[PDB]
Nucleic acid binder design. Structure first.
Ligand SMILES: [Mg+2]
Ligand SMILES: [Mg+2]
Ligand SMILES: [Mg+2]
Ligand SMILES: [Mg+2]
Ligand SMILES: [Mg+2]
Ligand SMILES: [Mg+2]
Ligand SMILES: [Mg+2]
Ligand SMILES: [Mg+2]
Ligand SMILES: [Mg+2]
Ligand SMILES: [Mg+2]
Ligand SMILES: [Mg+2]
Ligand SMILES: [Mg+2]
Ligand SMILES: [Mg+2]
Ligand SMILES: [Mg+2]
Ligand SMILES: [Mg+2]
Ligand SMILES: [Mg+2]
Ligand SMILES: [Mg+2]
Ligand SMILES: [Mg+2]
Ligand SMILES: [Mg+2]
Ligand SMILES: [Mg+2]
Ligand SMILES: [Mg+2]
Ligand SMILES: [Mg+2]
Ligand SMILES: [Mg+2]
Ligand SMILES: [Mg+2]
Ligand SMILES: [Mg+2]
Ligand SMILES: [Mg+2]
Ligand SMILES: [Mg+2]
Ligand SMILES: [Mg+2]
Ligand SMILES: [Mg+2]
Ligand SMILES: [Mg+2]
Ligand SMILES: [Mg+2]
Ligand SMILES: [Mg+2]
Ligand SMILES: [Mg+2]
Ligand SMILES: [Mg+2]
Ligand SMILES: [Mg+2]
Ligand SMILES: [Mg+2]
Ligand SMILES: [Mg+2]
Ligand SMILES: [Mg+2]
Ligand SMILES: [Mg+2]
Ligand SMILES: [Mg+2]
Ligand SMILES: [Mg+2]
Ligand SMILES: [Mg+2]
Ligand SMILES: [Mg+2]
Ligand SMILES: [Mg+2]
Ligand SMILES: [Mg+2]
Ligand SMILES: [Mg+2]
Ligand SMILES: [Mg+2]
Ligand SMILES: [Mg+2]
Ligand SMILES: [Mg+2]
Ligand SMILES: [Mg+2]
Ligand SMILES: [Mg+2]
Ligand SMILES: [Mg+2]
Ligand SMILES: [Mg+2]
Ligand SMILES: [Mg+2]
Ligand SMILES: [Mg+2]
Ligand SMILES: [Mg+2]
Ligand SMILES: [Mg+2]
Ligand SMILES: [Mg+2]
Ligand SMILES: [Mg+2]
Ligand SMILES: [Mg+2]
Ligand SMILES: [Mg+2]
Ligand SMILES: [Mg+2]
Ligand SMILES: [Mg+2]
Ligand SMILES: [Mg+2]
Ligand SMILES: [Mg+2]
Ligand SMILES: [Mg+2]
Ligand SMILES: [Mg+2]
Ligand SMILES: [Mg+2]
Ligand SMILES: [Mg+2]
Ligand SMILES: [Mg+2]
Ligand SMILES: [Mg+2]
Ligand SMILES: [Mg+2]
Ligand SMILES: [Mg+2]
Ligand SMILES: [Mg+2]
Ligand SMILES: [Mg+2]
Ligand SMILES: [Mg+2]
Ligand SMILES: [Mg+2]
Ligand SMILES: [Mg+2]
Ligand SMILES: [Mg+2]
Ligand SMILES: [Mg+2]
Ligand SMILES: [Mg+2]
Ligand SMILES: [Mg+2]
Ligand SMILES: [Mg+2]
Ligand SMILES: [Mg+2]
Ligand SMILES: [Mg+2]
Ligand SMILES: [Mg+2]
Ligand SMILES: [Mg+2]
Ligand SMILES: [Mg+2]
Ligand SMILES: [Mg+2]
Ligand SMILES: [Mg+2]
Ligand SMILES: [Mg+2]
Ligand SMILES: [Mg+2]
Ligand SMILES: [Mg+2]
Ligand SMILES: [Mg+2]
Ligand SMILES: [Mg+2]
Ligand SMILES: [Mg+2]
Ligand SMILES: [Mg+2]
Ligand SMILES: [Mg+2]
Ligand SMILES: [Mg+2]
Ligand SMILES: [Mg+2]
Lengths: 138, 175, 111, 80
RNA sequence: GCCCGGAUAGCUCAGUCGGUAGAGCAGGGGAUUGAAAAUCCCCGUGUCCUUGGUUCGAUUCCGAGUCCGGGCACCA
RNA sequence: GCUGACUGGGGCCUGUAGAGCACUGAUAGGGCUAGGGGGCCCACCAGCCUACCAAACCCUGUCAAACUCCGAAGGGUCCCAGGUGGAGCCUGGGAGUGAGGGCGCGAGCGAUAACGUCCGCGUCCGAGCGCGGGAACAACCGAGACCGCCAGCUAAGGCCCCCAAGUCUGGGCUAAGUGGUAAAGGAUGUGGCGCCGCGAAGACAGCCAGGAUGUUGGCUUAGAAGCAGCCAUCAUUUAAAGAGUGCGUAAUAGCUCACUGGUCGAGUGGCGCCGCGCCGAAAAUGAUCGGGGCUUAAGCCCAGCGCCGAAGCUGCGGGUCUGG
RNA sequence: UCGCCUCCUAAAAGGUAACGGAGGCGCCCAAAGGUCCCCUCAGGCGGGACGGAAAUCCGCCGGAGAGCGCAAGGGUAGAAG
RNA sequence: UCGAUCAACGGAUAAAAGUUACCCCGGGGAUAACAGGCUGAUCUCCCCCGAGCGUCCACAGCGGCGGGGAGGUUUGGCACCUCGAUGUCGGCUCGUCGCAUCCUGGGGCUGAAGAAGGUCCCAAGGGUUGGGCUGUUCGCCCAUUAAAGCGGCACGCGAGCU
RNA sequence: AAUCCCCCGUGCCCAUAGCGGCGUGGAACCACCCGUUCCCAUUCCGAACACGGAAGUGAAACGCGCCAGCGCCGAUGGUACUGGGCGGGCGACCGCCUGGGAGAGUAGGUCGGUGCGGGGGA
């Protein structure tokens, strides 16, 4: 689905969405990227919604990178009220300026119209990008 | 093929202002120098899209000297993804490490049209005497078959100068 | 293998001695000679010295040693030094090292 | 168990740490540092009790010493 | 309307080592017998409930949507 | 009886924010490789191929309250100075309190719900439901009310009328009554900054003008001879029409475009950015930005100058306590 | 659920709540105690009868990832093993 | 020096469980049940995207996976006025409003020949039946109908009735 | 005697002293080395520790150099965060002032420095 195997701890505190993406952010694997303009918990099921929209969009062809991963467990109570925490029930924290997704090996006009679909499945505003000198060398 | 920009100096003059000003803070340095400079953003941009830490940029700037720089850093701030500052490395004649682009030459040359092409590096890091700087590298290897990993020194090595290696890594492959 | 047995026991016995905080009567012994050097730490400083080298004596290495002890006491006691602690370094207290130490009383002592 | 709550414990805080800082005047007996491992070793005129606890041996002032991979050190300088 | 299950030749029901679906019970033929029944052999048809996905590959892994079985919530 | 909060200098203590991946774990893409998933040649040790399993290892790329190779701002404490304060310390007499709340910041629980809940540091209400602003309103802004005054200056907020003071001066924006409101998402609204393609070898708009050959394309067919259909979409002859984009359809007749000449005559089409706006936009008694009303403003952004404005500050007089 | 220990929450002093997230104790040892002396791990690769992923042996590499009676933390081979 | 799961672990007694719709007093809106309020997970309705089904396909009619909201009618969360009292479901009577429209009026599109439908837009003037069953609200069913609309008003309305 | 250089001790800074490669040293120091009678040793072994030695060797170790492949250290500039002071946003969050200011990374650095004492040369 997308999810770790093996966790150290089952549940973990919410924390803030403060700041800028802190890495990720420079477009390392592909010809075109999708970058986050807003912070959000992006869900294993939103990610896979986007991934499939793109493969469906081209031919089973192309190449797709993803590059954000849902390692943060997301609890919810049932309709109860208050005794303990839990349960269940996975997100990836995503700050502004991060490259998620990022396709390659496809025509610009394909990638861009697929990346546009892809971001319609996301809770945040997004930006399509290309690739650069600015994405350096390393 | 050959590139120059401009450059100016600065001492005080807070970066935020300069950056509001259409200009682009940066620094000039090398073993014998370190100096505070700025440039025009819109000007710099056009050049850097081209040069891109691959070709040499000769600056200009007042005095007027004209200084043979390699760009060795660009900090783009992550929110707007747009350069906030630039490192300009000035050459002198002592060997210096750097990034050379890569010319992949051929047809798929076996399993042609085709397997999958898979270029694993658009660059290589190489120690080079500034004087002779091999502005690209033709790499063909018409052997070019399914599954292999070409290492390093199997590259042309345009005449001037040696790898900054590692000699064993992954350049391309077909599958 | 890092940091040998020799250098462990070396450190081991020094450290213990160095806590009590007396002057240190340190003993080097080569296969040929035996030297002894009385140190004050925290000044990192040597005060009295005695060697089978600078005394140029020979024959029966143990008996040679008893002498460089008396040699040390005598020179040392002359500066006021009476109490110290026997370093014994990385050497079993025995034989040549024992002998220098029991030759180092008659003079400053407790060994 | 799992749900109701299996958690809920914690122990009392141990009020651990440094109790005298550099150049504070102390007297024989004053404990200088309260600590779990050997996180500071005893220095000049400084004892260590069985719970790893460091005290002044003599009246004086406390100096701190960072000896690199020899760890950190607390001494008391007399003029007691 | 809600959370959970089941669809497999002709009917009944298997089938987690992801990697070539078999056993019965029908049906046809054989051995058996005086002829059958029983019993033993042997036989074939599921494009294996549609559709997106993973995977080189899914009836065998995932998630929905259906035709149909279970447990669920009007109000004082 | 100078030691106080606060402040300056100096030392020491620390492991948060940020960041990092060296540890513990998680983790995307690739490489190289143990064991095998066994395709199998075995069914002798063999045994090779792996677009599946895979440790470690290299490369790229990330994540963590209970990870840290790192690590600020600040915070604590001691010394030395300033600091005479309804400050400080010592002994003793009298209490009351031990339901707190809002808000800001930092966390947890909760649903990145609650005028939710629980801690931390601040504040204010409590007890300042006294005063001014916010239409009205404990805790938001302003400000700490001893008494009096038909005197002055200011704070916040204001200066078109209700309503005290500008229908004040300059520059730009907006045509929705936006202002006077609510998102994804959308859109030749409108104004600026920019970049890219095409264009007086005369482009974009129109208009005048050509509207393929072998050939039905081989396929398929009563026929698709592009348009009821799956396609060798290939040789040619041209300044120049795809065996044909669409209406047509008794397959063909008739028809249009692409793609070209030509007429004219200066810009045209694409992208990105910022400002203001527009759609998205459905609730229950009678409506409304507090109201009237406002459109080069009485709205929004920029610069300015006056003024109005409190129990704050001043001026004058008085009261009481404390000090001298 | 109620006392005790470890970690986090805990906002880099101490301290700090919740029917917040996770675990442990109610023992044990006459040696697992005192001292003196000596010795140094785990792991990996290579070699070696029965010996196999591992018994024991030999080589090299291995600053601590092992050990320290039991949870966790801190500490620790210049020993606390 | 010993006897403590005095473990509700600062340890009332050496010695102790239940029930009350037969109940009582003192208090509390410090605290539950009703209603309101905040909230809006859940619920109802929109909207974005647009795999896909629809012979072909402009989405005629559908619409996966995901995304953003509106409303405040549900079930809840919270515990804020009210416990020196805010009478609770349902019916009846009497209405009034909202519009997310059931009918009638006017529209666009259609996979609209006509007639008849489908879907969406405008529109709140008026209308919106009678019965069997159950306390029922709902719902099912009979017979009709232009239709047999969904909500709010303390789940409107007990100093109006039952 | 000071000064310098080499060795031997022994401190200190705590990797800029480390790993690896290379080279170099025996007169003197030092080590390995000769032996196991004696003191003293090995859960077996003079391996180690110990003694009595002095024929040989700088092979090992140690010391001294030189190499930047690794390791270690590491600016300046710019950001992040932030004391204090202000704004903006339904929210999540964001910006301005003033003061402090990393981490990663880039440039470079580095094959140590040094105190006391001896022995020997100066
Ligand atoms: Mg990074
Ligand atoms: Mg969520
Ligand atoms: Mg409850
Ligand atoms: Mg979006
Ligand atoms: Mg604790
Ligand atoms: Mg027969
Ligand atoms: Mg028969
Ligand atoms: Mg004073
Ligand atoms: Mg201080
Ligand atoms: Mg963090
Ligand atoms: Mg890691
Ligand atoms: Mg942390
Ligand atoms: Mg550092
Ligand atoms: Mg003072
Ligand atoms: Mg007082
Ligand atoms: Mg008192
Ligand atoms: Mg109480
Ligand atoms: Mg209380
Ligand atoms: Mg409280
Ligand atoms: Mg704020
Ligand atoms: Mg509250
Ligand atoms: Mg709140
Ligand atoms: Mg408060
Ligand atoms: Mg009160
Ligand atoms: Mg007050
Ligand atoms: Mg009032
Ligand atoms: Mg007021
Ligand atoms: Mg008022
Ligand atoms: Mg008011
Ligand atoms: Mg007030
Ligand atoms: Mg007053
Ligand atoms: Mg007004
Ligand atoms: Mg007026
Ligand atoms: Mg005017
Ligand atoms: Mg208006
Ligand atoms: Mg309005
Ligand atoms: Mg104007
Ligand atoms: Mg103004
Ligand atoms: Mg005035
Ligand atoms: Mg007066
Ligand atoms: Mg007074
Ligand atoms: Mg910790
Ligand atoms: Mg703390
Ligand atoms: Mg703190
Ligand atoms: Mg603290
Ligand atoms: Mg327990
Ligand atoms: Mg081993
Ligand atoms: Mg082995
Ligand atoms: Mg350990
Ligand atoms: Mg432990
Ligand atoms: Mg342990
Ligand atoms: Mg530990
Ligand atoms: Mg109790
Ligand atoms: Mg108690
Ligand atoms: Mg207690
Ligand atoms: Mg009792
Ligand atoms: Mg009773
Ligand atoms: Mg009864
Ligand atoms: Mg009775
Ligand atoms: Mg009674
Ligand atoms: Mg009563
Ligand atoms: Mg009611
Ligand atoms: Mg209620
Ligand atoms: Mg009420
Ligand atoms: Mg809502
Ligand atoms: Mg709402
Ligand atoms: Mg809508
Ligand atoms: Mg409610
Ligand atoms: Mg209440
Ligand atoms: Mg409360
Ligand atoms: Mg009541
Ligand atoms: Mg009353
Ligand atoms: Mg009604
Ligand atoms: Mg309507
Ligand atoms: Mg109608
Ligand atoms: Mg009609
Ligand atoms: Mg119609
Ligand atoms: Mg009709
Ligand atoms: Mg009507
Ligand atoms: Mg009506
Ligand atoms: Mg009847
Ligand atoms: Mg009835
Ligand atoms: Mg019913
Ligand atoms: Mg009826
Ligand atoms: Mg209700
Ligand atoms: Mg009612
Ligand atoms: Mg009544
Ligand atoms: Mg009444
Ligand atoms: Mg009434
Ligand atoms: Mg270090
Ligand atoms: Mg020699
Ligand atoms: Mg010689
Ligand atoms: Mg040698
Ligand atoms: Mg650095
Ligand atoms: Mg800096
Ligand atoms: Mg600040
Ligand atoms: Mg730095
Ligand atoms: Mg080095
Ligand atoms: Mg030295
Ligand atoms: Mg000398």
């Amino acid at each position: 689905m997308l999810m770790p195997r093996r966790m150290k701890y089952r549940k973990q505190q919410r924390g803030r969405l403060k700041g800028a993406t802190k890495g990720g952010d420079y477009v390392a694997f592909g010809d075109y990227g999708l970058v986050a303009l807003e912070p959000a918990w992006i869900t294993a099921q939103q990610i896979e919604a986007a991934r499939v929209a793109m493969v469906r969009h081209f031919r089973r062809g192309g190449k797709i990178f993803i590059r954000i991963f849902p390692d943060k467990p997301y609890t919810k109570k049932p309709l109860e009220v208050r005794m303990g925490k839990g349960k269940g029930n996975y997100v990836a924290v995503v700050k502004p300026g991060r490259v998620m997704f990022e396709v390659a090996g496809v025509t610009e006009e394909q990638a861009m119209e697929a990346l546009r679909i892809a971001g319609h499945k996301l809770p945040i505003k997004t930006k399509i990008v290309r690739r650069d000198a600015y994405d350096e060398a390393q | 093929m050959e590139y120059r920009l401009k450059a100016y100096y600065r001492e005080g003059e807070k970066p935020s202002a300069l950056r509001r000003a259409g200009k682009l803070p940066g620094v000039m340095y090398n073993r014998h120098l370190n100096r505070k400079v700025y440039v025009d953003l819109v000007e710099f941009d056009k050049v850097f899209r081209q040069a891109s830490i691959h070709h040499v940029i000769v600056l200009e700037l007042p005095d007027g000297q004209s200084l043979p720089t390699l760009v060795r850093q660009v900090n783009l701030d992550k929110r707007r993804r747009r350069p906030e500052h630039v490192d300009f490395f000035v050459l002198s004649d002592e060997p210096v490490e750097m990034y050379v682009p890569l010319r992949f030459v051929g047809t798929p040359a076996g399993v042609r049209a085709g397997g999958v092409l898979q270029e694993i590096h658009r660059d290589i890091l190489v120690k080079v005497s500034p004087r002779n700087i091999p502005e690209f590298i033709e790499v063909d290897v018409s052997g070019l078959e399914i599954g292999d990993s070409l290492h390093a020194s199997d590259l042309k090595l345009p005449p001037g100068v040696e790898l900054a290696v590692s000699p064993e890594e992954t350049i391309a492959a077909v599958v | 293998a890092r940091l040998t047995a020799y250098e462990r026991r070396k450190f081991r016995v020094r450290n213990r001695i160095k806590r009590t905080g007396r002057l240190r009567l340190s003993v080097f012994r080569s296969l040929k000679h035996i030297y002894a050097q009385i140190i004050d730490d925290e000044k990192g400083v040597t005060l009295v010295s005695a060697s089978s080298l600078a005394l140029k004596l020979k024959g029966n290495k143990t008996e040679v040693a008893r002498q460089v002890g008396r040699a040390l006491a005598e020179k040392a006691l002359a500066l006021g030094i009476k109490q110290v602690a026997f370093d014994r370094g990385p050497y079993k207290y025995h034989g040549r090292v024992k002998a220098l130490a029991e030759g180092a009383r008659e003079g400053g002592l407790e060994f | 168990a799992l749900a109701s709550t299996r958690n809920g414990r914690d122990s009392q805080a141990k009020r651990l740490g440094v109790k005298r800082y550099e150049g504070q005047v102390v007297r024989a007996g004053n404990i200088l540092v309260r600590q779990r491992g050997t996180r500071f070793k005893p220095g000049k005129n400084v004892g260590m009790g069985r719970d790893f606890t460091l005290f002044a041996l003599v009246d004086g002032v406390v100096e701190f010493q960072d000896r690199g991979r020899l760890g950190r050190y607390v001494h008391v300088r007399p003029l007691a």
